[PDB]
Design an enzyme around this catalytic site. Structure first.
Site, PDB file in Angstrom:
ATOM      1  N   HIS A 148       0.774  -1.267   0.000  1.00  0.00           N
ATOM      2  CA  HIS A 148       0.000   0.000   0.000  1.00  0.00           C
ATOM      3  C   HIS A 148       0.816   1.336   0.000  1.00  0.00           C
ATOM      4  O   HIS A 148       0.450   2.320   0.639  1.00  0.00           O
ATOM      5  CB  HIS A 148      -1.004  -0.067   1.132  1.00  0.00           C
ATOM      6  CG  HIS A 148      -1.574  -1.425   1.259  1.00  0.00           C
ATOM      7  ND1 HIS A 148      -0.861  -2.425   1.868  1.00  0.00           N
ATOM      8  CD2 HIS A 148      -2.652  -2.012   0.707  1.00  0.00           C
ATOM      9  CE1 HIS A 148      -1.521  -3.560   1.765  1.00  0.00           C
ATOM     10  NE2 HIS A 148      -2.618  -3.340   1.060  1.00  0.00           N
TER      11      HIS A 148
HETATM   12  C1  LIG Z   1      -6.872 -16.569   8.083  1.00  0.00           C
HETATM   13  C2  LIG Z   1      -7.785 -15.713   7.296  1.00  0.00           C
HETATM   14  C3  LIG Z   1      -9.061 -15.543   7.605  1.00  0.00           C
HETATM   15  C4  LIG Z   1      -9.705 -16.168   8.805  1.00  0.00           C
HETATM   16  C5  LIG Z   1      -9.837 -14.665   6.732  1.00  0.00           C
HETATM   17  C6  LIG Z   1      -9.552 -13.363   6.902  1.00  0.00           C
HETATM   18  C7  LIG Z   1     -10.279 -12.387   6.116  1.00  0.00           C
HETATM   19  C8  LIG Z   1     -10.131 -11.092   5.990  1.00  0.00           C
HETATM   20  C9  LIG Z   1     -11.190 -10.569   5.042  1.00  0.00           C
HETATM   21  O1  LIG Z   1     -12.268 -11.519   4.885  1.00  0.00           O
HETATM   22  C10 LIG Z   1     -13.586 -11.111   5.278  1.00  0.00           C
HETATM   23  C11 LIG Z   1     -10.640 -10.199   3.653  1.00  0.00           C
HETATM   24  C12 LIG Z   1     -10.775 -11.353   2.661  1.00  0.00           C
HETATM   25  C13 LIG Z   1     -11.365  -8.950   3.102  1.00  0.00           C
HETATM   26  O2  LIG Z   1     -11.289  -7.832   4.025  1.00  0.00           O
HETATM   27  C14 LIG Z   1     -12.511  -7.190   4.433  1.00  0.00           C
HETATM   28  C15 LIG Z   1     -10.806  -8.576   1.711  1.00  0.00           C
HETATM   29  C16 LIG Z   1     -11.788  -7.700   0.893  1.00  0.00           C
HETATM   30  C17 LIG Z   1      -9.353  -8.061   1.814  1.00  0.00           C
HETATM   31  C18 LIG Z   1      -9.019  -6.955   0.822  1.00  0.00           C
HETATM   32  C19 LIG Z   1      -7.600  -7.035   0.376  1.00  0.00           C
HETATM   33  O3  LIG Z   1      -7.237  -7.972  -0.570  1.00  0.00           O
HETATM   34  C20 LIG Z   1      -5.930  -8.113  -1.047  1.00  0.00           C
HETATM   35  C21 LIG Z   1      -5.506  -9.166  -2.062  1.00  0.00           C
HETATM   36  O4  LIG Z   1      -6.324 -10.083  -2.661  1.00  0.00           O
HETATM   37  C22 LIG Z   1      -4.121  -9.243  -2.538  1.00  0.00           C
HETATM   38  O5  LIG Z   1      -3.877 -10.225  -3.472  1.00  0.00           O
HETATM   39  C23 LIG Z   1      -2.926 -10.086  -4.529  1.00  0.00           C
HETATM   40  C24 LIG Z   1      -3.175  -8.368  -2.032  1.00  0.00           C
HETATM   41  C25 LIG Z   1      -3.489  -7.404  -1.078  1.00  0.00           C
HETATM   42  O6  LIG Z   1      -2.499  -6.586  -0.668  1.00  0.00           O
HETATM   43  C26 LIG Z   1      -1.901  -5.749  -1.650  1.00  0.00           C
HETATM   44  C27 LIG Z   1      -4.864  -7.190  -0.532  1.00  0.00           C
HETATM   45  C28 LIG Z   1      -5.233  -6.131   0.496  1.00  0.00           C
HETATM   46  O7  LIG Z   1      -4.464  -5.287   1.003  1.00  0.00           O
HETATM   47  C29 LIG Z   1      -6.630  -6.083   0.955  1.00  0.00           C
HETATM   48  C30 LIG Z   1      -7.032  -5.088   1.987  1.00  0.00           C
HETATM   49  S1  FES Z   2       2.951  -0.947   1.662  1.00  0.00           S
HETATM   50 FE1  FES Z   2       1.000  -1.517   2.442  1.00  0.00          FE
HETATM   51  S2  FES Z   2       2.118  -3.192   3.247  1.00  0.00           S
HETATM   52 FE2  FES Z   2       4.061  -2.225   3.042  1.00  0.00          FE
END
Ligand SMILES: C/C=C(C)/C=C/C=C/[C@H](OC)[C@@H](C)[C@@H](OC)[C@@H](C)CCc1oc2c(O)c(OC)cc(OC)c2c(=O)c1C
Ligand code: FES
Ligand code: HEC
Ligand code: HEC
Ligand code: HEM
Ligand code: HEM
Ligand code: HEM
Ligand code: HEM
Ligand code: FES
Lengths: 183, 248, 431, 431, 248, 183
Positions: A148
């Site tokens: 980010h």
């Molecule tokens: C052990 C894990 C468990 C229990 C589940 C945890 C879940 C958390 C959330 O689930 C509800 C999550 C999926 C949800 O957040 C609201 C998504 C919209 C997250 C949005 C999301 O995606 C990314 C992604 O795909 C990437 O890929 C190449 C790379 C990423 O960084 C650059 C991201 C990223 O920075 C974010 C914020």
């Molecule tokens: S830049 Fe968002 S993780 Fe280091």
């Protein structure tokens, strides 16, 4: 009363403490199992790294950074007001309580010289843990994590973005001029 | 002279696990692997319990490994396994053998009247080491290799001293393993007379620990499930006594 | 209340005996029939298509598990073996990968159909909230799905999204190594993420039980936003038709079209949505140059990185807490909460107009939110320079205000339109 | 017809609003209550214990999936790592392994409680038949679970039990390499057997839905075998009590006892039931000397190897088909069909006495089938020598005849005993 | 210039996959692996389609393997993979690179205006080979190793011909890979002028096949989903036309 | 409109052919994938095998048996009435249509001699596919599969138990006296 209403709620306490400390070991399994429970120091044969580049290295899961700081990157790293840093702690384990001066982001070379020439921090960015592009990238003649968009100077201190702390300097230490112990 | 764990609330003998550790390193490690035992566990609770920095020094001496990343060698660390001694002349990986062996036939061959006793495994190990004999029934100059063991049921029986009918008309059978303890073969620390029996009593309990290293934990766990489900049970009995007595 | 229709009388002798022991004949009769309002348009297909896409996922999901090996050293290669050697195994992988986009494309059209026509608002609040937890699960599920082939997109998102829970102060570091299974994102992570990406879509299927349950119980909604005459029985007949064979067949049709679409996408552009660095075997030392989150997480992606510590409202809050809600944890809270204010939607519409096209002031803020969304997904692809940092900050804030300011205003500050009183009356209005 | 209880009137204001949108309050009230006959003895606990054991399995089943690696080179070692290094991972492995015995011990007691007391017999046919497919599934599931840690028992049972389908003539060789994923029992088998040992216990929970559904709909059975006064409402009150808090609490208690039992078994003898050659890493070249099937498969094991081609009835049928039902395939058909004549049990009791202790001729053939079963499980441990080949042939034939000859006889050839007419009356014969 | 597969219902060029195969074996195999490509697939339908017993002979010549059971070498078989050429001086395993590279904007990182066209990958390959240049503006010596490529965006640049501000004043960046096709470097069978462009046009389509070997199958599949879901759709439209017209 | 009658039932045909040949590729995946789709011959250096024992060997998933038949085991295998066999086919691919005489359960050495000395069948028992204990075990001076108790003679032919055929002799062939090609 308590002859036909005490030994009712008492049992549902035991029917909660038993099905509680049975639902705790269901949680604990997901922690770090003994195959990764500890992992102690490693030795890095620097000896033949060229000047003004970085050498990336895996230790305890995630990369470590070693850049041998070239001329531009010690001038423009010393040219930095301490009060114009977010995190103003050194982020050093070697020099714990110290503040983030360009002399606190460093290793001594024989075991005592310290010239600004040894930059050893680890490749986990402080925002959400990605790796920074090196060799003067982004906007502070330093390091650009494209995840980010955090920005780092040339001592790994934090400038732009969301990353709330500088890059941590680990428990690095020399042994002779060919070698560094990460411990 | 009857093991220490075995019983209803016995534990591992602190002493005997250490005593039996040395016997593996000096005698058995040249022909046997522990590829499912991480070396670091020597220093663990409820085992032989050694010094961590000793364990490191000990581990250094075990042989090299084509390490998975660099693709080249190093002195073995304590995080790593014992080596896979299975090449040639080598025996089974005894990595988890002391629960892989249970030559216990009866009563009525289904597992029935073992009612003061146990399951059988560490005591097949004890009997495997002790029972190396002179070739009883017939057979001349050995079988070259294949040594007679009085316990090892499952290997070589010559048909000259099998049968005309079918079966082996001998008890044990011929191994592939040399009689590994010619007595007093190493030296102990807590006094302890280094007999061929006392070394084979001792290396049995150690190889049980390379099968159930978390054993003294289940003994501890048992007492607590006994309280907890015990007085949830006792309490649930009282909740049926003085709730059903309206209709009783 | 319950829209009154002629229920199940076990008529023939077969069904008379069946019904004494397992009444499934009638339960399927009384749910395949159902007085379903007759004015329903094609924005109502997107719940059958969703349910279908859940069965399709569930089904292709298991084929893949008969072949994919969840362990770091084997993982990317196994997936790769599925492409080459498993008979039809490329058409499984592509279909289960592109499926999740369809699953998510349509869940959005589902949600904006529901946002227009008052489908969050009473009697419909429990229908709505149950869809939230289905949403939450669907995202976290498609997260864990992506981690599995251990490519670079897989790997780094696992380092990011687990790190999101590290943003929690105090207890948050612990929650990290708990989901991680330690220090880093090694293997213990990929083994636990095989497990839960299998379990959770069954919990999801049990929650569409409780979603189908709810929208039957409220009575099915219609686009006038008026309820479906639960007074006599023959005026319900002018208001409604049975699902089968009218609304079954409509939902089948559009599905066959939706699927006609979806099959061409797999057949002739199957890696369009996929960000090609997942074909780059996961490197724990290099985070790629162009690390984009997958498209359906992009607009929430952008909410997280609107709020750097230059954004004044952050500085304020980092100011007022004096150190704790810095732009890390702020942006977390921002994004997580950008969803929570969408959960909050029936409580923050104050207007007792249910619907949409008899509400012309609301009608134009809404197409600003549709826009907002598309712009928010868009600006997730864009870097953090000027103008993009501003654009993202505009989109993020429009969003966040539509549920907080614009919605519990507009009740007070707007009168209706010509709203009908009969579901039939609107239906008869053309001829 | 159905036992008349006072159902759910949504009383307080909370529940009045809930009920307009999701009536779950009342569905749990009208199933936790239920006019459940009051004479029920401890042979009725074994259905809660079963349902618990399924939750216990499902639960520890997933823990294990966060750790166990399904591929041949990793498989036995991963399981082995779970014993050593996973925090409490030995107590998970032991509990999920010994669970399947408990899950199976008690399903037998469940089945012989049902076999005595007419619980197969109307109205109860669909209750029964659904339990059959739950049985089939539970067996096949526990099979695939045992293949997973790729020890010698694991390996060879997979070579055997897949090979069983090869016994089918013509199409049967194909069905083999279909379950196998080719020529032999390599890895494609252990990847597919990871998948279906995960899926199938969810299908099993969905069929205990339709099992709990069915026994509610028939009305719960009692040991008099008389039905539960569905004429007035206050005579049903003398006949029944509600589940909660009378029969919930009884089923809780015995479970806490059954679990007091089961925990001592895991803690102090956890490899008793397990046949130690599974700790012998799977060798595709040596089938072990003492290859015994797992205990809960042992009496049907024996039915397969009763019928060698010395057994005259085999020779006959190999005779009559002139080549096709040789003692391979015959013993398959024999064993599969040994089950099928237990499915057939409500159609082949001809007697219209429902129950049991008012049927003294039937009551002694039954304790021969309990014995038969115990002898059949026993003789599976035994070799194929004399007397064991005869013993097994006696056991196998007794079995097979109890459902075929003895059961649709005894209707004709036996009159009752003093059978009551009230559920209360038996209960009061005690007060 | 314009590939054969690409289009709406085009297939792999039978000729060109064969033509390009030879270029990998002679030029690229010394520095690049295909560790995710099983060698037997050369003879497969919808590819270059070779002789099975040739494929065997060809596979014999690729180097040895510490075979997983014996623990010792042999001549490589056709069931096996191409070797992992990733040691030193070695490049990336191009085993599935022609879907691992897509240096394409939109304006979006994830993509936009690609509506007559495609996704981008085989054409990064073509441009990687052709675009080996002399050093533009300045950077007038090399960098010892690191060769200027006009296409390779992601690598080294001497900051001399990056900037004073941020980015590169000279077009692409400096590789690490020597200009691999000095023209007419091998000889063709179906005539075909062996140009540096014609060799780089040709080895591009082969390395696409090492990414989508099942490609001409999805083209085939597409036509059948178009019929099947096409006239299930058309048939479902007719079932709403003449069923809803009672209420219409 | 006019094309309407069986159109109702026509669509449910297409709503069956489409959800039929979509439920067929769900079946086909479970077949042998191309990692095991074929397998080809191997060479076995017998040469230094000693006399009167068996050598067990993996080929195509499951073991192959090579016993060099000692004196007892060729007398008592020739001493066998052809009509006192269940399977009276040779179970040989080398000698296809042949019947199960002790000369049809064999191979060449000097590509042509054939003495009763080379017994090569494969370790898949014909009942349910386990391995037989060797070196004269069970009851026919042969081989006892302890799975459901089949008994084999000293030519791998079938005697007691449920196993309906003899052990198959594969496509074995010699190349010189040190070596056997299984193809
Ligand atoms: C052990 C894990 C468990 C229990 C589940 C945890 C879940 C958390 C959330 O689930 C509800 C999550 C999926 C949800 O957040 C609201 C998504 C919209 C997250 C949005 C999301 O995606 C990314 C992604 O795909 C990437 O890929 C190449 C790379 C990423 O960084 C650059 C991201 C990223 O920075 C974010 C914020
Ligand atoms: S830049 Fe968002 S993780 Fe280091
Ligand atoms: C090499 C000279 C060895 C020494 C030292 C030890 N063992 Fe061993 N062992 C060896 C071989 C080649 C075998 C093969 C199996 C056979 O046919 O006999 C074995 C066997 C065993 C076994 C059991 C194998 C079985 O089939 O049951 C056990 C339990 C065993 N060996 C234990 C053991 C112990 C405790 C040793 C130290 C005193 C020891 N072995 C040393 C080779 C050699
Ligand atoms: C050794 C002298 C090589 C020859 C012959 C070939 N390649 Fe290569 N290549 C080599 C190295 C060390 C690298 C490193 C990455 C870098 O910094 O440049 C490469 C790179 C590539 C790449 C892309 C890597 C990237 O970062 O995008 C590709 C697509 C590639 N090489 C292709 C390729 C082709 C088609 C070749 C045959 C004509 C070829 N390479 C030969 C080393 C060497
Ligand atoms: C992803 C799985 C989902 C499935 C399988 C599904 C299925 C359905 C179905 C069949 C309907 C009835 C009408 C229609 O199709 O439009 C419906 C309506 C509805 N859904 Fe969903 N849906 C899902 C997701 C969601 C989500 C994610 C939400 C909330 C954010 C939600 C909230 C609603 C609402 C509010 C209605 C309208 C109620 C009514 O019409 O009475 N649904 N859904
Ligand atoms: C709600 C339903 C589902 C969703 C949204 C979903 C989503 C995903 C996604 C996005 C991927 C990554 C695809 C890729 O990048 O290749 C994936 C992979 C995978 N999922 Fe699923 N999935 C679902 C259901 C299931 C189920 C029930 C299973 C249980 C077996 C499963 C098993 C797998 C496997 C084995 C993979 C690896 C295959 C691959 O990466 O190509 N999926 N899933
Ligand atoms: C393994 C999963 C099973 C679960 C979870 C389960 C649960 C239950 C429960 C709660 C009951 C009500 C009374 C009682 O506990 O005795 C019951 C009864 C019954 N079950 Fe099952 N049971 C299972 C297995 C089976 C099987 C395997 C069969 C058939 C072979 C079967 C046939 C029946 C019958 C006939 C009744 C009596 C009906 C009545 O009392 O009206 N059940 N089961
Ligand atoms: C009907 C419920 C179940 C039954 C009868 C059952 C039975 C079994 C059995 C007998 C084993 C072999 C245990 C051993 O020998 O160590 C096993 C292993 C295993 N099962 Fe299950 N199980 C059930 C539920 C589940 C479920 C739902 C899962 C889904 C994740 C699962 C996952 C596993 C795993 C990972 C193993 C290997 C662990 C081990 O072998 O110790 N189990 N199961
Ligand atoms: S498998 Fe050979 S006897 Fe049953």
């Amino acid at each position: 009363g308590t002859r036909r209403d005490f030994l009712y709620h008492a049992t549902a306490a035991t029917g909660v403490v038993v099905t509680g400390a049975a639902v705790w070991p269901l949680i604990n399994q997901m922690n770090a199992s003994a195959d990764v429970k500890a992992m102690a120091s490693i030795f890095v044969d620097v000896s033949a790294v060229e000047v003004g580049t970085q050498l990336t290295v895996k230790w305890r899961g995630k990369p470590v950074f070693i850049r041998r700081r070239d001329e531009k990157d010690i001038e423009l790293a010393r040219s930095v007001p301490l009060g114009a840093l977010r995190d103003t702690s050194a982020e050093n384990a070697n020099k714990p309580g110290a503040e983030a001066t360009d002399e606190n982001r460093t290793l001594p070379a024989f075991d005592g010289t310290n010239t600004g020439e040894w930059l050893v921090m680890l490749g986990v960015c402080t925002h959400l843990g990605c790796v920074p592009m090196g060799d003067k990238s982004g906007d502070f003649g330093g390091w650009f994590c494209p995840c980010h968009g955090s920005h780092y100077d040339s001592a790994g201190r934090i400038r732009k973005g969301p990353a709330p702390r500088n890059l941590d300097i680990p428990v690095a230490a020399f042994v002779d001029e060919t070698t560094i112990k990460l411990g | 002279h009857a093991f220490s764990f075995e019983g209803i609330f016995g534990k591992y003998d602190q002493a005997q696990l250490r005593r039996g550790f040395q016997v593996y390193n000096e005698v058995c490690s040249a022909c046997h692997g522990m590829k499912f035992v991480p070396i670091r566990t020597l220093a663990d609770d409820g085992g032989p319990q050694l010094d961590p920095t000793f364990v490191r020094e000990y581990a250094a001496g075990l042989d090299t490994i084509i390490d998975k990343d660099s693709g080249e060698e190093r002195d073995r660390k304590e995080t790593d396994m014992f080596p896979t001694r299975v090449g040639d002349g080598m025996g089974p990986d005894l990595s988890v053998m002391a629960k892989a062996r249970a030559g216990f036939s009866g009563p009525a061959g289904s597992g029935m009247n073992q009612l003061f006793k146990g399951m059988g495994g560490p005591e097949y190990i004890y009997n495997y080491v002790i029972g190396f004999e002179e070739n009883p029934e017939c057979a001349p100059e050995g079988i070259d290799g294949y040594y007679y063991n009085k316990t090892f049921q499952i290997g070589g029986v010559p048909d000259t001293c099998k049968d005309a009918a079918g079966v082996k008309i001998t008890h044990g059978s011929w191994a592939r393993m040399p009689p590994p303890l010619v007595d007093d073969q190493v030296t102990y620390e807590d006094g302890t007379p280094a007999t061929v029996d006392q070394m084979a009593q001792d290396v049995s309990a150690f190889l049980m620990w390379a099968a159930e290293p978390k054993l003294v934990a289940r003994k501890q766990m048992g007492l607590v499930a006994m309280v907890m489900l015990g007085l949830l049970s006792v309490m649930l009995y009282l909740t049926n006594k003085r709730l059903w007595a309206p209709y009783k | 209340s319950g829209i009154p229709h002629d229920h199940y009388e076990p008529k023939t002798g077969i069904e008379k005996w069946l019904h004494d022991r397992l009444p499934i004949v009638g339960l399927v009769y009384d749910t395949i029939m159902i007085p379903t309002p007759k004015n329903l348009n094609w924005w109502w297909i997107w719940g059958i298509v969703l349910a279908f896409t859940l069965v399709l996922q569930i089904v292709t999901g298991i084929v893949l598990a008969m072949h994919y090996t969840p362990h770091v050293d084997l993982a990317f290669a196994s997936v790769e073996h599925i492409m080459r050697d498993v008979n039809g195994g490329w058409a499984m992988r592509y279909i289960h990968a592109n499926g999740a986009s369809l699953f998510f494309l349509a869940v959005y059209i589902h949600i904006f159909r529901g946002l227009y026509y008052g489908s969050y608002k009473a009697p419909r609040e429990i229908t709505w909230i149950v869809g939230m937890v289905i949403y939450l699960l669907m995202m976290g599920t498609a997260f864990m799905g992506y981690v599995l082939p251990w490519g670079q997109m897989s790997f780094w998102g696992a380092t990011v999204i687990t790190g999101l829970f590290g943003a929690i102060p105090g207890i948050g570091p612990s929650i990290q190594a708990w989901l991680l299974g330690g220090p880093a994102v090694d293997n213990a992570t990929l083994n636990r993420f095989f497990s839960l990406h299998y379990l959770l879509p069954f919990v999801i299927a049990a929650l569409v039980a409780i979603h189908i349950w709810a929208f039957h119980t409220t009575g099915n909604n219609n686009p006038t936003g008026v309820e479906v005459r639960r007074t006599s029985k023959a005026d319900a007949e002018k208001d409604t038709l049975p699902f089968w064979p009218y609304f079954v067949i409509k939902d089948l049709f559009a599905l066959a079209l939706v699927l006609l679409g979806f099959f061409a996408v797999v057949a002739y552009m199957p890696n369009y949505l996929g960000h090609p660095d997942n074909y780059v075997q996961a490197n724990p030392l290099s985070t790629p140059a162009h690390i984009v989150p997958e498209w359906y997480f992009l607009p929430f992606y952008a909410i997280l990185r609107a709020f750097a510590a230059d954004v004044w409202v952050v500085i304020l809050v980092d100011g007022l807490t004096f150190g704790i809600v810095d732009a890390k944890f702020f942006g977390v809270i921002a994004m997580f909460g950008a969803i929570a204010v969408m959960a909050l939607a029936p409580w923050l519409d104050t207007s007792k107009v249910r619907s949409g096209a008899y509400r012309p002031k609301f009608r134009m803020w809404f197409w600003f939110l549709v826009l907002d969304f598309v712009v928010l997904t868009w600006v997730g692809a864009m870097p953090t320079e000027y103008p993009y940092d501003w654009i993202s900050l505009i989109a993020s804030t429009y969003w966040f205000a539509y549920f907080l300011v614009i919605l519990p205003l507009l009740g007070a500050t707007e009168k209706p339109e010509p709203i009908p009183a009969s579901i039939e009356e609107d239906f008869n209005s053309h001829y």
